[PDB]
Every structure is written in structure tokens, then in C-alpha cells.
Design a protein around this nucleic acid. Structure first.
Ligand SMILES: [Mg+2]
Ligand SMILES: [Mg+2]
Ligand SMILES: [Mg+2]
Ligand SMILES: [Mg+2]
Ligand SMILES: [Mg+2]
Ligand SMILES: [Mg+2]
Ligand SMILES: [Mg+2]
Ligand SMILES: [Mg+2]
Ligand SMILES: [Mg+2]
Ligand SMILES: [Mg+2]
Ligand SMILES: [Mg+2]
Ligand SMILES: [Mg+2]
Ligand SMILES: [Mg+2]
Ligand SMILES: [Mg+2]
Ligand SMILES: [Mg+2]
Ligand SMILES: [Mg+2]
Ligand SMILES: [Mg+2]
Ligand SMILES: [Mg+2]
Ligand SMILES: [Mg+2]
Ligand SMILES: [Mg+2]
Lengths: 131, 139, 135
RNA sequence: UAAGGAACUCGGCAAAAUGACCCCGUAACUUCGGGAGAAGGGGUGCUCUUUAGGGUUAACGCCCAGAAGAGCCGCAGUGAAUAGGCCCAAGCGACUGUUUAUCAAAAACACAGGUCUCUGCUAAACCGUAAGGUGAUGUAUAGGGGCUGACGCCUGCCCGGU
RNA sequence: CUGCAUUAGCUAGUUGGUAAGGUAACGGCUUACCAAGGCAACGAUGCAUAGCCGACCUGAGAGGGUGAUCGGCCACACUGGAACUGAGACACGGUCCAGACUCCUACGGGAGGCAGCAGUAGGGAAUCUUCCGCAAUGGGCGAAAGCCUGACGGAGCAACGCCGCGUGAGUGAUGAAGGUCUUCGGAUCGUAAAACUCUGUUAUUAGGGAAGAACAUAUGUGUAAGUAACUGUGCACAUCUUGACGGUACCUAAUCAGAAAGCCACGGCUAACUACGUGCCAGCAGCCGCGGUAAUACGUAGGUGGCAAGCGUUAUCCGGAAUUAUUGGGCGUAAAGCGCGCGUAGGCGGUUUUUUAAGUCUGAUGUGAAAGCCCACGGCUCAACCGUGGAGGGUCAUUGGAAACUGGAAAACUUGAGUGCAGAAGAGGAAAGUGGAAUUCCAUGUGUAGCGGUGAAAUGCGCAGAGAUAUGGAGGAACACCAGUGGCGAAGGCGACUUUCUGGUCUGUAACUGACGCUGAUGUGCGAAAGCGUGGGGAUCAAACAGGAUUAGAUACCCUGGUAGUCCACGCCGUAAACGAUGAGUGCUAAGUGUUAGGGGGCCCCUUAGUGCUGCAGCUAACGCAUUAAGCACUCCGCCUGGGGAGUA
RNA sequence: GUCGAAGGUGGGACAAAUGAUUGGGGUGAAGUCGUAACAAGGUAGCCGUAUCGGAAGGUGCGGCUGGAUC
RNA sequence: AAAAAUGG
């Protein structure tokens, strides 16, 4: 059955980006919403909407394509997984694409990007890479 | 035979201790021959090998390498024809064997006229004669 | 495999065999047993000396000796160079390195060591054949 | 019966040796039952002290039966008598049984199992001249005869001859 | 902190308790009594191997390999046992006993143990001289002078390693002679040589000649404690005396380019080509290969390349090797999805709130010896080397903080998973019963010269009347048509009809439970055909077998027969190209079109679950796959690591 | 007197070496017999199983396409 | 839809 909702969400984003879809509806959760908001703030997606419907709720992402229809999101990679979880210290926080990408991290100070983790001098579970 | 290496080492050491005592292997007969200044010398050395080196050995008259030869001449023919199927195997020769003068060695003559035996195979005929003569025909 | 599968049964590397097994074994006479010691060369005694025909496509009469080593192992050793002075019961030094043509010959006899004589007339690469500098 | 210990002899024939009870322990192989008492070892008398029990009785008493310890004596304690020698292999017959009374006990006979074959019942087979009987007060999962001979794996070719 | 399951059970002082003894000390450490415990798939037990570590080699790293020298710890002292002395030993150069082995003996008895430093024999491919000295450091005794110290400080031997410097430097075309090649012009060795000029690293000779040396002790002076005072004690300052190395390093002066260059390679990898000799011979070779007459690969020569007091060969480790892939690989056809279910352990797991702080993150403190790697500085003329100071190295320990995520606790939710209600189809399974066609055989009637079969024939059956044809009877097996990439089942598989028992699946509501889920080692079951056992049955077909043909032969293919078997019941066997050569679950990603079972809305549209075909993106070595993925992802399981040997022993 | 090394006796376990003889395996040539596979390989092949035959293989039963002209 | 092997 389903075993990694974060991975499912990232894979939904990847598949929609490949097909050059505009929007994306997925079941919602707090961690997913925080990931989507981080993506919007960083500029990888155009917009995020939350539908507080019955059951679980829904997250509606709107993807962003540059000029010439170029895709802003090159790739997403789940790093920590149910089968093997990865954590990193502040001094060992990884740089995605030499800094051109973000690493979404989950920290005691909320889920943030690797830049914020390094700035605040914290570590945590490296949720994902996005470049 | 389990003490043959010990035997070789003992022989070497004995030769080093005694210049006049020699040991050598004979290729034709394969036997190891011990040479000495006399029966008493060799007897003492044999006893010494038996006890000091604990290599019991037996001694005898060395074997003599004999040779064979043809006393009478004759023309002969060798034919090997296995043509049972497919690509077979064929060969034919007519050779005159003659007693050579003693000490002159083997002499091969090629009196082929008209290419009855192709010039490619004549060296093979000579090599076959040499190989077959290496093995004795009588003893 | 899954990470759980790898934890349960970790990965196992292929084991490597030596090309010169006879040099990796010693013999203790007092205990009458073998021992694992790596040697660069071993002394031996030529049990037999002769010539062998190489495997096809090559053709020649390659000089070789069947040698019993100091560790009691019997091997075939090629005799390099032109001409040799070896016979049965000769004491020779044997090093590793097989001769591709000869199937069962996996070692070389050092030239200019123990009984084996240097190559006569050799002038280039003499050290490989145990020949003194003529000068 | 010194010393020896199968040198005897066709052959260990005879003899010697083992032998009871308790405890420890016990192999190949096997049809899983066995082999097994395998083998190989230890203990065993007497006195005293302490002490768990069982049967029968109101109890006493009587009877059975252990355990621990400390001692004593001899060359030796199932102190006599009675009471397996054991082991490793091979052939044959599966096995218990039967036999030449009175020179042969076996590898011979029998055997459970297998197969062939005859027999539809007033059966076939068998005794008898017959009557009358056995078979059988049975009825083909039965009865008679031939051959083989537990069990396991199997059982080839020939119907010219009789 | 190590390998093996082709080692799965181990343990009886064993596990605990009570008492006693014992030891520096707790304790089954030991002994009595009470109980039956204790260990083990988180790998006990057993077997094999091994001193451990700081470190060392390698690698970009992750890792892999190793455990010389030097330092720490452990263990041992001919093998085994034991104690005595002693603060300390169950004691390398101590004791006792036993054993093996040397030597002395007067035969009664005695002595001994180089895995201390040299050395001997032996083994080996292989590893040093039976040196000087206690002068420095350290240790034992003593108040001290001092004595002992094969520790140690230094010589000898070895290119064994690293590092440093040499074997000359400048001008030198006049391109000398000579070697090699040559198109006979010349080209090359070549500024190389010769000749001139210079230098002395180094070498030779002669002088000067360190540091390492602090000292201790002795002797004067003071000063502190205590004493009535004194000697003495400690301290401070002073003075003579102490070096094996060794007259060694080093410095100064003089003489000479004179003593001091070898090794491998030159086909590709890979820097470097020509000639002669040889002729699948001799030989080379790390791999591809080279050598049979004009070889840049063999041998020599010239030249060239790489190094240089070294250069090559061999052995071993790491790398290259992503070729065990955590970083960082795979399983349709290349090796690799168990034949398939049911399921235990383990792994993993839907949404929200509160709480905890084991994992996670962030500080402080201690510690991670010295030496070593790395960075900086300083000292040997530089370097190796030496010293100093930093830096780093933990999966480490205590302690304070954070709460998103994983884990624990508590409480809610309905989407997953099940239950209810309304329907649907099905060769799903087991057991009885009933049919019709055909084959075989049997009994009759008619009827006669063949039938059967092959490429052709023959065997065979028939003339004792076959085959053909008509009627009936006996028996076994399989179910024509329907029938279809149709249906059902986990797979194997399931096809006449009827009845009885019974499993699963799909569709629609959203009453109900509220994460109850997924996967699944070990287990436990099913599993085509053949085969096996007992008993039954026996038509057809048909291994074996027998004839007849074909053929050079024909232990076959073809023909005529024909036994097991094929069939049934109950057991066993457990394998197939058991295949979609594609594990299960879940979600996401263009479309066109057929078909099966449903459902909703107006012949049409939408929809759920299957079953086919075509086809994007993406994937693939290609072929191809493609909402029934071989795409994009996450969880679990099984499996692979060149071919053969071998699915063998 | 207790404990107690070595030693002695006994039946087992494990490991290694060796052994008349024997089984298949690999390698080596220009050996002998056939021709099973690759083409429709001249009977499509292959998988499991059974049986038979000097040998490759043949035949039976079931399975696969990794076969199939017209 | 008869039979027609083999070739370092
Ligand atoms: Mg007597
Ligand atoms: Mg007597
Ligand atoms: Mg006798
Ligand atoms: Mg006699
Ligand atoms: Mg008797
Ligand atoms: Mg009997
Ligand atoms: Mg009897
Ligand atoms: Mg009787
Ligand atoms: Mg009688
Ligand atoms: Mg009798
Ligand atoms: Mg009989
Ligand atoms: Mg019999
Ligand atoms: Mg060891
Ligand atoms: Mg001592
Ligand atoms: Mg495959
Ligand atoms: Mg499958
Ligand atoms: Mg063929
Ligand atoms: Mg064929
Ligand atoms: Mg046949
Ligand atoms: Mg050919």
C-alpha cells in the first residue's frame, strides 16, 4: 500500500512536470503543505491552494514554466525514505547543484531549506532535493 | 624412492667433501652413476650414505646403451591409406634402405623424379624416418 | 536489493586465486605439514628435463624442467634463453610467471642462479638471463 | 601345576575363562521392531550413628524397604553352590518350526508371500467294483494340483520341437 | 572488535537461593542442602583461524588490506603441574615433581634450558660482528665515593629503504678520424671528440679541532626550619675534576679531470626504428599475439626512449574494477522472479490534535597517552631527519536546550482494509445420476475374392467365407455443434446434461468497525505429464517388444500388431519452455479502437472491473514495452555476479 | 586423607595421508563409428518424465514457441 | 508425400 506520501507527492510533481501539465491535485497533509509552500517561496512552482474538503483535504499546485516553455523544475529526489532515513548536521548540510538547487529539510525549527538550516545552524531529516 | 631427494643432496655433499667421488645422470639409460677410485672407495661411500645420511642404496653394473643397424639392403614400400569417409589420409613411399659405413650416421637421399611425391612432403618423409629410427626396430 | 535485504545478508566479494600457488606454500619438516608463506622464489631439483610442443597455433620445441621444490611440490618450469646446462638432479631457482603456450608450465627458472647457467652470447637484457657484462 | 600361552590340531576338539544382583555406559547397520546383557567399566562383607518412606493396627507391635556418614577385618566379601565368554568379517537359508527311531539336524523339508493352472457345484481332485464318502454341511475373496519361497529391486529373447 | 549453518541445539556447579568455608576483594570461587533453571536463529554449541591497539599501505572519498621497526596492553620462558620466599611471582638466566632432551659420575648420585647480546648447526629465496664503553640517559644497592647494567650510548657488516652530492664546467665546425645506414648526394653518433681555459664537490696529503659535560662528590660563603648551643639537613652562589664514540664530524692550506655509469625498453597499450643473421626452427610473450626467406615483436649491431647508483624480474596488498554497486549495478530475450497459494517472525506503514524526548539537532565539561598522518615555525650548509605549537581523530560519557520528522503514550477522522443491503456472470471445486455420436469386440442374414496399407510394397486379416452391408448385444473412454486474444481459478488447470454440498470475483448504496494494512525468511499446503504401491477396469491410443519396409547400416522416421500406461479409488512422487522466460502491494503519467459482466444519464454520452489490438511522453543495447509498462516513484520478498567442470562430488 | 600432573585401559567423534581397483571430468593431436543440432538441417526444435538402443539419440505422455512454406 | 553420408 501507500508507504511514503512525500515521495508520492514529489513523483506527482515530476510526472506532471514531464507532461507539462498546469495544475496538480493531490491528497493533503501538513508536511506536504509545508513542502509546497517552500517550493512556491523558492520559485519552483507558480502557486499553491488548499481545499479543506471532507476526508483528508486537497493540495492544488500550479506549476511554473519559463520562457520558451522551459521547465523551472529540473528534478526532484526523495532522500530520506521509510526504508532508510537520512539526517544531517548543520555543518554537513548538502548543497544541491552547487547551490543552484534547494534541499528541503525537516528541523526542530520547522521544515526549511538547506540555506535556512545552515543560517540557523541546525540539522534534521533531509526530506528531499529539488533542482 | 621417497628418499631420492635426500639421495641427491647426500651425493652433492659427498662430492663436495671428496673431489675424487663423482655422480652423474646418464640420459640414455636414466641411471645415476657413481664413479670412484676403487671398489673400497665406493663401498665405503655406499655404507656412509646408508648410515650417516640414512639413504639405503643398492649398486650394480651400469647399463650399456646399445644401438641397431641394417646389415642388408632392400627396396621397400610404405603405404598408409585411410580413405573410409570424407577427407581421409593418404601417403605412399618407395625407399631403398642400405647399410651405411659405420660412424657415417643417417643419410637421406631424394631420388624423386616428376614430382610423384610433392616437394612439400619430402621433409615430412625425412622427419618420419628419423622419428621411427629413434625408436628401435629390433630391441 | 533492499537496504533491509543488505542488512540481513551483506554483500560478499569474489575471492581471488594466486597465479603461482606453489610459491605461496612452505613445508615444515619437523611437524611434517605445509605452511602459508609468500615467497618470491623457491629452490628446487629438476626431476626431469626435456622439450615440449606448444599448443596451436605456435610450433617449437620449448625447453622445460619438471622440478620438485623445497616445499615438496612438483611443478613444471620453463627454461628461458638460448641453451641451458640443466639435467636431472640439477638444483635451480624458480620464480613465478607462466608461459602462455605451454599448458602446465606456470613458472620460470632464474638464469644465473644455483646450477642454471647464464645465456651464452646474450648482450641485450642480460640481467634477465644471468649473463655477466662481457667488457 | 613353574615359565610360556594355540607354538597343539584337519579344526582351540577338550579344557580353561564368563556367569548372580545393583549402577554407569553402549557402535556399524536396520525392515525402525531391533542390533543390546552389544561392547566396556564400577560396586557387593561386617559394626555403629544419623535419617526419607511403604503395608497392617487405637496404639504398642509385626512386616517390606531405602539414603548418608563414621569405623572393623581378611589374600579374597553374589568369600560356598547354582547362574552369558565376547568381538570383527564372509557363504547359505528370511525368520519360529520339521527330518534319516538306531552313524547325516543341514544349505534338506515346511513356512507366510508370489505365480500358473484346473474347477459353475451330483464342482474339479481324491478313496472305492459299486453303493457310499472326503472335498464341504464349503460355492470362484472357494476348492484341488504344479512351480517358486519373508521382504526390497526386478524377472530379458525364442512358440522351430514336445 | 573474525570466518563457517554442507556446524541447531548447548549446559547439571549448569541457573538461582540458604548456610558454611575461602580470597586483598564481590561472586558457584568451592562445598553441602532446596528448586529447575540458564544460553540460543539478535547465531548459542561446535569447527577453523588469530596476540589486541596507537598505527601502516592503498583509495577522490566511502571503503579495502595489514598489525615489521617505535610506544601501550596482554600472554609465554624445553612441555605439564605445584607451591615457598616476598610489598609484589605461582617467578626467562629461582625451588619441587612428572615428561622429553643434553652433559658429568666413583653408578650411590649430580648439573642444565639463548623466544637476553654475539655466534653455531638446521630450515630458507632471505636478514649483521662471539666489537668499544658505562663518557651521556635510565635502573639496582649505599649517607656518599662508588660497583653492576649486551638496557642503553656508540663502532663493524648489508644500495635493504629514503634523502643529499658526485662521476666535471666554459669556448669548441675545423662538422676531424672511426661505427651504423644510404637513393651513394650524403645522414647520424655530434659540441659529441680533439685542443685551449677554469673548478676541487669528491679523492689524496698536512695542520686546527667542537658541542654532546649537566654533573655527583669535594671546598668556602652565606640563608630557612628546629636546638640552649653545636654538628649536620635543604637551598643559593662560587671554584678544581669527568668523553667509548674519536683526533670522529667539521674548518683551513696544497695537487690532479685526473680514480667514480650502469640497467631496462623501442608492434599497440607506451616515450623510443633502421640494418644484418635465422626462417612456424632457434626463440619472444603482461594481454592481443610475433617467427614458414625483405621480422620496427626472435639474436646481434647502430641509433633512440625512460631512469640513474641504481635498473629490471618475481612474490604480496590496494587501485584502476560501478567486477558485491551505502556512496554506486541489476533480474522480458545477455547471469538472475521461487510453479503457485495460506501464513509466523522481521521490515514498512493513511489524516488530525495533545504529550514524551529513545532516534534526530544544538551548546558546555571530561576524555580519546606519547610517537605517527596533516598545517605552521625552528635546528642540522639543504633534504631525509629532529624538536616545538597547532589542527584533526568517538559509533565515547555526564549535563543543559529545540520538537518538524521516525519511535512511545492519549484522544479524534474515513479515503485503505473489512462488514451490511441490492444485484450479476462464470468449463471454480467435490459426489451421485442420465444421455447421444463414434471406435473395438461378439451373434446372426445377404453376399464373394479381396481387405488393409504405402512413395511403392510387404507383414497382417480372408478364402475354414474376410472386407462391405442390415439388426441386435457387451464394455471402456472422451463429450462434435455451441466455442469466441470468450469465461472462471493463486497456480497447476476447468468444456455433454441433471441434482446435492461448497470457494472466489465484479457492479451499486454509504447502515456499520475505524488503519484492523502491505510484504513475507523459517513453516504449512496445492501443484501438468510421466512414474511408483494396493485394488479394480480395459474400448481406443500406445513407451517397451515383435514382425514388414527403407537404407551402406536403420537398434529410427513409414506399415501391421502390441504390453505397461492411458481410466477409477485411496496413498506416494513434487518436477516442466510449471512462460507473459516479466514477484507482490500502492499511487501518478497523451490518446484511438474491439470484446465480457455490470451501473448511471439522454441509437448516443458517461462510468467501474476485466480481456485484446494500435499508439505519445518516458524507458531500452537493440528488439521492443507503453494506464493489463519493460515509464515515474515508495515498501517488502526471492534471485544474479565470465564460460566449462556442474546442478556434478 | 582430600585435590591432583603425567601415565594406563576402553568405546566412540573428527581431521589428514595412503590403498589393489574403479567412476565420471578436462586436455591433446589430421585416430575409429555414425551425423543428433544450426536451413523445413532433410522426422521442427526444446523442457519434464518413462523406457529402449554402440554412440550421438529414438519412441511414448504432457508442455513451450525461443517454429511453421502454402 | 521413397532414399541420397562425409570434408584437419
Ligand atoms: Mg600353568
Ligand atoms: Mg603360573
Ligand atoms: Mg598352528
Ligand atoms: Mg604342528
Ligand atoms: Mg568346546
Ligand atoms: Mg533356517
Ligand atoms: Mg531352529
Ligand atoms: Mg526326532
Ligand atoms: Mg540317524
Ligand atoms: Mg545326529
Ligand atoms: Mg524351492
Ligand atoms: Mg531361492
Ligand atoms: Mg598463533
Ligand atoms: Mg628470574
Ligand atoms: Mg536468462
Ligand atoms: Mg511467476
Ligand atoms: Mg540431422
Ligand atoms: Mg531433424
Ligand atoms: Mg524405438
Ligand atoms: Mg571443414
Amino acid at each position: 500500500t501507500m508507504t511514503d506520501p512525500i515521495a508520492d507527492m514529489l513523483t506527482r510533481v515530476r510526472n506532471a512536470n514531464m507532461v507539462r501539465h498546469e495544475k496538480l491535485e493531490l491528497p493533503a497533509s501538513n508536511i506536504k503543505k509545508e513542502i509546497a509552500e517552500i517550493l512556491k517561496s523558492e520559485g519552483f512552482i507558480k502557486n499553491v491552494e488548499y481545499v479543506e474538503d471532507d476526508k483528508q483535504g486537497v493540495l492544488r499546485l500550479f506549476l511554473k514554466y519559463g520562457q520558451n516553455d522551459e521547465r523551472v523544475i529540473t528534478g526532484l529526489k526523495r532522500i530520506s525514505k521509510p526504508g532508510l532515513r537520512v539526517y544531517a548536521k548543520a555543518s554537513e548540510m548538502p548543497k544541491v547543484l552547487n547551490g543552484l538547487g534547494i534541499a528541503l529539510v525537516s528541523t526542530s525549527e520547522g521544515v526549511i531549506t538547506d540555506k535556512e538550516a545552515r543560517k540557523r545552524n541546525v540539522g534534521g531529516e533531509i526530506i528531499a532535493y529539488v533542482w | 624412492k621417497a628418499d631420492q631427494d635426500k639421495m641427491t643432496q647426500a651425493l652433492v655433499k659427498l662430492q663436495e667433501e671428496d673431489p675424487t667421488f663423482h655422480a652423474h645422470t646418464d640420459e640414455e639409460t636414466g641411471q645415476v652413476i657413481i664413479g670412484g677410485m676403487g671398489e673400497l672407495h665406493l663401498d665405503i661411500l655406499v655404507d656412509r650414505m646408508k648410515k650417516e645420511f640414512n639413504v639405503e642404496c643398492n649398486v650394480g653394473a651400469p647399463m650399456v646403451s646399445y644401438r641397431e643397424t641394417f646389415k642388408s639392403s632392400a627396396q621397400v614400400q610404405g603405404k598408409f591409406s585411410r580413405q573410409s569417409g570424407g577427407r581421409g589420409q593418404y601417403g605412399d613411399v618407395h625407399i631403398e634402405f642400405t647399410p651405411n659405413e659405420t660412424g657415417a650416421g643417417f643419410e637421406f637421399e631424394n631420388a624423386i623424379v616428376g614430382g610423384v611425391v610433392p616437394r612439400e612432403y619430402i621433409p615430412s618423409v625425412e622427419a618420419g624416418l628419423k622419428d621411427a629410427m629413434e625408436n628401435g626396430v629390433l630391441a | 536489493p533492499t537496504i533491509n535485504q543488505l542488512v540481513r545478508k551483506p554483500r560478499q566479494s569474489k575471492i581471488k586465486k594466486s597465479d603461482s600457488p606453489a610459491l605461496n606454500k612452505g613445508f615444515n619438516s619437523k611437524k611434517k605439514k605445509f605452511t602459508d608463506l609468500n615467497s618470491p622464489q623457491k629452490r628446487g631439483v629438476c626431476t626431469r628435463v626435456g622439450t615440449m610442443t606448444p599448443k596451436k597455433p605456435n610450433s617449437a620445441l620449448r625447453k622445460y624442467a619438471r622440478v620438485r621444490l623445497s616445499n615438496n611440490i612438483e611443478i613444471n618450469a620453463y627454461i628461458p634463453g638460448i641453451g641451458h646446462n640443466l639435467q636431472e638432479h640439477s638444483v635451480v631457482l624458480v620464480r613465478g610467471g607462466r608461459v602462455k603456450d605451454l599448458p602446465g608450465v606456470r613458472y620460470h627458472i632464474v638464469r644465473g642462479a644455483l646450477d642454471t647457467s647464464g645465456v651464452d652470447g646474450r648482450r641485450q637484457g642480460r640481467s634477465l638471463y644471468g649473463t655477466k657484462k662481457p667488457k
